């Protein structure tokens, strides 16, 4: 429980410049932070935590770090070299309603984008003490203006932040959250408030 601090701040320290890994990150720099992740696990303070979702899991999320990478040509034709630019990743979880929601932020400057976003609502349901399946409902991009932009790569760009299939939350304390799926990605998250999305 003070290795739990010592480590979320080495945790923190090592993201410093990575970008969430979300554009990749080199060999070293992956291999420290899975290190410190794989730690934090083996000392998680919540144990079955689908029987806690309400006072530990409830609420607004913002992605620190995970195994997805957008890089070569879908990120060239997601265009986001130079004129989109990537930005928040939340997770919401709403424990009543057994939902899920992922809103992955955009931007754009030159197309006066100022605020923009892909929405994915889903369901959940719990399927063991630390599992829940996750189910897709529906997902839309906004403004239309980002949706022109978009549309014809729609489903591939959908593709890389779905949450359908099943989320294992290996660790969750008052302010962080760790999960594997279904295709053994990693996803870190910290706490954050619903008005910042």
């Not at 070569?72 to 899920?100: H, N, W």
């Not at 359908?164 to 408030?193: C, M, P």
Request: charged share 30%; hydrophobic share 40%.
């Amino acid at each position: 429980e003070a290795a739990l601090g010592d480590a979320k701040d080495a945790l923190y320290a090592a993201l410093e410049g990575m970008n969430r890994g979300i554009f990749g990150m080199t060999s070293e720099k992956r291999s420290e932070i899975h290190a410190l992740v794989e730690l934090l696990e083996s000392k998680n303070p919540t144990p079955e935590p689908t029987d806690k979702l309400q006072d530990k899991v409830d609420g607004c999320w913002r992605l620190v770090y995970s195994t997805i990478s957008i890089l070569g040509k879908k990120r060239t034709k997601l265009g986001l070299r130079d004129f989109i630019s990537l930005g928040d990743f939340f997770q919401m979880i709403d424990v009543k309603e057994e939902k899920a929601v992922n809103v992955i932020k955009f931007s754009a400057r030159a197309l006066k984008i100022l605020s923009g976003q892909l929405t994915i609502e889903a369901s959940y349901k719990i399927t063991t003490k630390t599992k829940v399946d996750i189910t897709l409902d529906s997902s839309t991009i906004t403004p239309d203006q980002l949706m022109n932009i978009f549309q014809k790569n729609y489903d591939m760009l959908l593709a890389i932040f779905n949450p359908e299939g099943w989320l294992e939350i290996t660790y969750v304390d008052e302010s962080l959250r760790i999960g594997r799926d279904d295709k053994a990605n990693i996803f870190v998250l910290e706490r954050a408030d619903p008005s910042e999305v």
